[model samples]
Target chain A: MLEQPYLDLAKKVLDEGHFKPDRTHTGTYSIFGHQMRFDLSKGFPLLTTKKVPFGLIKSELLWFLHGDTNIRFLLQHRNHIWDEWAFEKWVKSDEYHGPDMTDFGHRSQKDPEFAAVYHEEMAKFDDRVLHDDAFAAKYGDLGLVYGSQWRAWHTSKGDTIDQLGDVIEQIKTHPYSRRLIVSAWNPEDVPTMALPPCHTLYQFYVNDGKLSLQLYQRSADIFLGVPFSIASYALLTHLVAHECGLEVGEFIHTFGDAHLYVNHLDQIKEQLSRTPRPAPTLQLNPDKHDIFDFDMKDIKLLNYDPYPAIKAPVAV
Target chain B: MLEQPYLDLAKKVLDEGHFKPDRTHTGTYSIFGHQMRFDLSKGFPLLTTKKVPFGLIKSELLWFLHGDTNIRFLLQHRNHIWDEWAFEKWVKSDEYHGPDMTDFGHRSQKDPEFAAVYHEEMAKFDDRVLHDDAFAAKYGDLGLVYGSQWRAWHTSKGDTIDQLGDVIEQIKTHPYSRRLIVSAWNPEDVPTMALPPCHTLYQFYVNDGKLSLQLYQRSADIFLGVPFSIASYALLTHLVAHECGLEVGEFIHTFGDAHLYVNHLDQIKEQLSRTPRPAPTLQLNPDKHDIFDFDMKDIKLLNYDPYPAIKAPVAV
Candidate 1:
């Protein structure tokens, strides 16, 4: 379906987007752009980089879909990757009011000094503190940006669950409402968020009857992250299209500050140097299109070959 | 410097930033949680993913540093990307009045539409377009969200280029002025932009005395355009840091929606496969930190390797 060369067109965009310095740098600069595309033949777009162990991507995605913000269950299957910061924040934030002081009975019982060291120790045992879903959800800020906004955005007045469901239903019933839009960047509530939204807004469109979704990401990480992000969103698109009774069309990506880490450079070059393998087919359990009932075992990626994984340092 | 696994960390952010079908979809999905990591040690990340010759990256960046937004000279180097859009807008705009469309000997050509198109097309042919350093200062949004407001931001009284130069100077001088922020999504201006700002706002920071930048892009195109965006911003960061008399620290990218083209999936896998080679070095004339003084000839990327390029359909 891609009749024109995407690379060429994108380059054109990059050229137009470059900002030259006039008054400030008098001789300085700035850069920006965004891109997205989709496919109907494929089931899901799990990135074929570094041979991501199958179920992990599916499971993590499922976890997010279920709105399971805490990595408690995830930790049972995987390690600390997504939930580390929230875990750390939970312990150190006075929100919990933590344990006692004198004999160190409750909060101070094992941890003390009330500083970075204490926080470090608290991180080691965040699981015990984050025992329930309520505690997790309270501090997790789960739907703040995407989850809640996508599934259940909170309004100044009340909940918009039905409104969200209506879009899904519309996809199934109408499939042509220019109203197929989702936004996570809540300006009024941004200050209260543990982290402000970045992957902000996206809209769904039906061109020639194919369902395509475009995402507007304000920031991006090229390496380990982009792949999963691609997969999860593509899967979401697939799910939405299927649930809405339309076919999966294109997954468009638009971005703001796209950058590679000095560390990820080698990894990036590594990915660039290899021969491109054929796309693997992802199989979503055809039996279940319901948004909530899907599981890790329900999804599958057909054939994928990738070079050995290379590690890189992260820049925060 | 980034102690945590930013790729994984960024993925969580991407996940949080993902738009799901809830209430937020019905309304505006608040963009949130997109993140990117940059390591300056890596050669200027002139991505080779889709044949964006590093030469163009350097040249266009130099153009922005020169503050030239006329789009003609850039079209000269490779191809004409902006001409069509600019032409369409220029010809249809009201600023020309009427007589501008006299068509060599027409009677009533006193309309802005005809006059505007004539001047715009003529200006493209003029050589001064290159030296017209004020083009962007006047017309060059450089795709920045803050550009319009920089020129005509609405205030209690009226519109003016308020607080723009002060921030840029702070970026060049203090290097850590919290004031170094620019916004594109003005409540009132969103309606005026022919194209809403994609690369929204960016913040300038100095770490350990090194000048660095953080961009909060609300969207991204992972495959075709990210490389160019990365390289461009890296250039901007380099220029800004150098001008500020500091080393380039880290570029933190936080995003909203990030995705991969279904067609480009194979390419993504391929790029992710190869063992990342040692990071290529970016050679820049060290003495020429004045961003404008630097051009294509002044920059070079050495030792880059990857797979063959792939193609995908464009979302636009």
Candidate 2:
């Protein structure tokens, strides 16, 4: 794996970007935003950084694959990186968001106290969106904008939502078909959305039984957004590949505002300070990548170790 | 205002961009899937190819500021560019997805058979978000993502939801705040979304009452998506300035997956075929940029005449 190159760049950006150290979220920060296109035909996209935790990454990957919006399920399986906030939000709300987590069970927003309880938590609200519909409906969706637009655009009469599933199903059933894509930028929908998209949306191109996903983010929070997005979408690529009976081809990220934060100076340096180990291997249930069926236990990450998680605050 | 430079660049990009011709959509198709950026500090972004209807552009900008999602208000005043699909979707489902547009005397989604009866009506559902609630919820927002995170992120909570209202409120109340952003890239929400955002989100900045908006898009559909986006957001800038008690600053568009389509070959040529007009004036109601109470009728686009709308097919 290539250590230092990516981190070096990240660090250089952090060192020079606009940062009001005392007033910023992190100790010191900078914005290192960029748009990178990786031709999967080259090699796997295991980031050359210090080894990404296999288990944590694997669990997070599987969470997205399940298309599960809640984080409680993810936390139940020993990944508490995002638990505090999600659990806190769950306790604060008075309504249920979406599907129930099989292992973690369900939580209601009846009392709506997650914010006040763990107002100090970082990933809680991000987690709560999965279990809380109101929150999910309002704030839980950065991905929803994409899923809804891609799978369900309006038709002639405009009554029938044209879901991308037909194409996904077609790709699975007819791997050679040249028509498979997922779009997040809807001309008709952009105006009504609560928030415009960042990694707006993207498409999946399956060639030779290999599935490649291309993402289009209008803007990016270089520090916090890009890494998570890369991991998240790469996981999506893996799951989509598994479900479609294809091999994970490539995950390409295209950006508009791919800028680093004015903060994150020390963190970027610290991350670069460590040596990058081999990319952990992700073991998914060989039988499926079908987004709907995967669970935490079905996947596993091996051989990942580095420094502890850095505590950079959320930008919201 | 500089015209030749932008027109030259626009032409050059159109010529070099890939295009695809089709026998569908607007027939004998042409498309130029290319992206170009403009620095507002240089001058107003009126294109030279044709007289950019400064009045229309300014008015549309105001519409976004007013947070009115519906296009009915715009159509009533003879501006129907965004009317096509909004009405199509409305006719498909007249459920009034978000807020009521009828308070302004327009038909509400509550009217049964509204979609069935008015699927092709010229006066309603103008392929746009026509409701202020719906519009503001989606496009009504300005600088929620980057601005909030950069200036004052509520990291203690870990969620980005709390940043929305403040961003919007800041647009009207704190015209001088430097950090104004809106992000829609929630990792937890991506899986369940119909489409992930390509132009995911954005941020706005101001210095001495001068407003600037910067967008971060993940992917861009060069031909169909880019031009529309550029114009729309530029228009949004004018509107935001008019309603925020500030002067129009700048509109910056950042893209990730910005690519030329394989079909828009000839359209790119057509755009290059014409000489650009001068940068027209974007007149506004300078007296009150903070007047959110105004409707579409209160705004207008003047002197916009270019070549006929170049027709092309959408690569959905």
> Number of the top candidate by TM-score?
2
DockQ of each: 0.03, 0.04
In order, the interface RMSDs are 11.4, 12.2
Measured by lDDT, the strongest candidate is: 1
What are the TM-scores, per candidate, against the unseen true structure?
A: 0.46, 0.56
How big is the positional error of residue A283 in model 2, measured in Å on the Cα after superposition?
6.8
Score residue A110 of candidate 1 by CA lDDT: 33
On the 0 to 100 scale, the lDDT of residue A250 in model 2 is 61
List ranges where model 1 is wrong by over 4 Å: A1-31, A36-44, A53-56, A76-79, A94-126, A129-145, A160-164, B1-316
RMSD of each: 15.3, 12.5
Model 2 lDDT vs. the true structure? 0.50
Q: lDDT tens string, model 1, A204-286?
A: 66544567776655544555555556666777777776666676777776555443433444566565544444566766677
lDDT of 1 by residue, B1-316 (tens): 2212232332332344333232212211222234556677555545433345566766666554554445654755553444434444433556434433334212113434455656555465333334566643333223433333443344423324433344557666565333355544443334345555556556665535665666655445566555656666777777666666677766666454444433444555555443333444666667776555776666667665533555544433
